[PDB]
């Protein structure tokens, strides 16, 4: 991956690109399904981490814990 | 000795649940950050020597 094609070589670069280019493959990216996947997968990875840690904690503790007007009726009796 | 590690793991599980929520919260706001654009660089911030 080439570092920092600065701003404006293109007027020359595409002048010199077309002479040597045989096959371009541009990886145009979508944005909305990408963000949907990213947030869902982040929830998935953190939920899987916490599920594993819940199971580990409950088993480890369930194992290690068994091993460890006021003087009327008081004057005549 | 077992009670101490039980307490540590019990803190850790709820801390992990907290982190699981927090990372989603930060990932919601990580999508509204951009490198500031000018007229000389316009966000790329690299120019010819």
């Amino acid at each position: 991956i080439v570092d920092r094609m600065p701003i404006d070589g293109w007027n020359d670069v595409w002048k010199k690109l077309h002479q040597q280019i045989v096959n371009v493959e541009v990886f145009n990216v979508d944005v909305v399904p990408a963000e949907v996947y990213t947030t869902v997968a982040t929830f998935v990875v953190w939920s899987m981490r916490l599920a594993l840690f819940v199971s580990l904690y409950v088993w480890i503790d369930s194992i290690t814990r068994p091993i460890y007007l006021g003087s009327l009726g008081k004057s005549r009796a | 000795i077992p009670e101490f590690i039980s307490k540590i793991s019990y803190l850790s599980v709820f801390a992990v649940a907290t982190l699981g929520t927090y990372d989603i919260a930060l990932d919601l706001g990580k999508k509204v950050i951009c490198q500031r654009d000018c007229k000389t660089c316009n966000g790329w911030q690299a120019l010819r020597c």
Binding site: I1, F27, V29 | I33, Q35
Partner: peptide, 17 residues
Amino acid sequence: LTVLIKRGILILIHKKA
């Protein structure tokens, strides 16, 4: 996709992964 390097740098990248 867009990486956030500390001191506030948003770097654009290739497709993903």
